[PDB]
Amino acid sequence: ESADLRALAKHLYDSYIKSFPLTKAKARAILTGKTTDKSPFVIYDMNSLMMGEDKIEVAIRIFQGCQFRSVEAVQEITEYAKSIPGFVNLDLNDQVTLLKYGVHEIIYTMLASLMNKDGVLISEGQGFMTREFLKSLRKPFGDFMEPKFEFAVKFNALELDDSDLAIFIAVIILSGDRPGLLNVKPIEDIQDNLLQALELQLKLNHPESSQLFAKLLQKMTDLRQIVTEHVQLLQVIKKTETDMSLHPLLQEIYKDLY
């Protein structure tokens, strides 16, 4: 049983590496300055943003950039989900439901991998935009950016690696209590096994942190409240900003969400 849980953990990690180009390992190699690759271009104000356009209203332009990356990330997450044993055999409408309610929780999680207290890696690590530049963006855009860093700081304190994250993300996707699911048990059964794989992963990979599994279960709960607030912050933008356009994929995900 345990051997099979480790094989599952490895399968998920290998799929995670195929599905997500910029891993936390690669990202930390960039942020700490340990890569043979040339440094990311730092964007900290309007002037540096202008200069680095080829390397990578201003607030609206940055928001659209976030949208384009989110659309790309949704497609990466979808490919990863399809690698989770049993997922593609679920009712197709349930697969859609799991992604609809799952993707933004996963994006919050995976953004953390690319973030430190000072900023976020963008354009596959070719750019680095500072937290304070993003927070300084005029209302209501500044307050849309900051919560992602606030979560990242707390989440990164857990010191998870890519192997941990692969299973954590899989558990989140296979949540049997998403609104409107038709066949709950097959999803719950997959999640129960993924949760066993996660517990064993954390016991072996973080032996001196017994609390980690319980904390991660709480983070899954926290992410729901975080994403609800994210959806509210988007309404302060979408409803008030007249020339604001949402990408069709994102419009679909946000439509009738909760």
Partner: peptide, 11 residues
């Protein structure tokens, strides 16, 4: 019929 469904069905 949706974009998520189309992404899910692509091999």
């Amino acid at each position: 019929p949706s974009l998520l469904k189309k992404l899910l069905l692509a091999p």
